[PDB]
Amino acid sequence: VLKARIRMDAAIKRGELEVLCKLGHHPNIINLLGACEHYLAIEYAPHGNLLDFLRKSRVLETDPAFAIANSTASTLSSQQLLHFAADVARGMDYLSQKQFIHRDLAARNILVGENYVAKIADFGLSRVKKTMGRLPVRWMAIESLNYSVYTTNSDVWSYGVLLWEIVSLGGTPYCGMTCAELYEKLPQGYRLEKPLNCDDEVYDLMRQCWREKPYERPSFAQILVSLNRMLEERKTYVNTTLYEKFTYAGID
Ligand SMILES: CNc1nccc(-c2cccnc2Oc2cc(C(=O)Nc3cc(C(F)(F)F)ccc3N3CCOCC3)ccc2C)n1
């Protein structure tokens, strides 16, 4: 994958053209510009992947003097954070009505484009039982861990974890927990805990994505509605201000 001019900025990769074309276009997915050879051209995202971008906003760690002085934990606001969330949901709604199943929803696979508009991507390398590489276990629905099932509802569970990645600023999900104990504890109804900077209502939405029953989970259309409600309220939903006992959700 290489940076290039000709839209100007593009990320060029050198059978996949059928899949990209059939996705059509949407402001919340990657944009297929054109192709040929002697080479797939996609619109470059100046802010790179969401994970790294969420982590680079941890200003206390990067620029502590600046952070303390401003009483800020993040260069992103609750408005920006929730807009990333609504961006992914809008793209996943678009993508799921075309019966596209991602199977790898996580911050690492979302791009931050022009105007900080989040875009679904897939950095795997080719596209009814479905194909799987190495399992992203911390992002996986109970029913994928057991049974190896993949549907829009399992995508919704992974979205729940991405929503958690957004609020925690790139925290590693279940920090301190082994992959093995997830297979064991999730069936028993264990779920990820509410982050400290998180409002109860964003936590409820995450919990809705993690219902045991796949068919009880909300649709991406319903998830966008919930988030839009939060963004329209005066209420701040994600705390980004420092306080005496502040600690970031752990990364490693
Ligand atoms: C850092 N900035 C940046 N901007 C744009 C792209 C990239 C980037 C970085 C590293 C690797 N790849 C890219 O960009 C992509 C991204 C994709 C990509 O996301 N492709 C697919 C996306 C989707 C989506 F989920 F969005 F609907 C679905 C299928 C996709 N591909 C999957 C691979 O095979 C063809 C179809 C394909 C090619 C390239 C060159 N980086």
Tokens of 136: 């992203």
CB neighbour burial string for 136-165, b if at least 16 within 10 angstroms, e if fewer: bebbbbbbbbeeeebbbbbbbbbbbbbbbb
Ligand 1 pocket: which residues have CB below 6 Å? 1, 11, 13, 16, 19-20, 23, 29-30, 40, 42, 44-45, 48, 95, 102, 111, 120-127
For residue 206, count other CB atoms closer than 10 A to its CB.
22
The strand pairing partners of 3, in sequence order, are: 11
- Could you give the CA distance from residue 86 to residue 84 in angstroms, rounded to a whole number? 6
Q: From ligand 1's centre to the CA of 7, what distance in Å?
A: 16
- Could you give the CA distance from residue 43 to residue 17 in angstroms, rounded to a whole number? 15
First-to-final CA distance of the chain: 27
| Contact of 159 with 223, CB cutoff 8 Å | yes
Domains and CATH numbers, the chain: 1-47 (3.30.200.20), 48-252 (1.10.510.10)
Q: How was this structure determined?
A: X-ray
| Contact of 224 with 34, CB cutoff 8 Å | no
SS3 60: helix
| Contact of 60 with 246, CB cutoff 8 Å | yes
Q: What type of residue is 209?
A: C
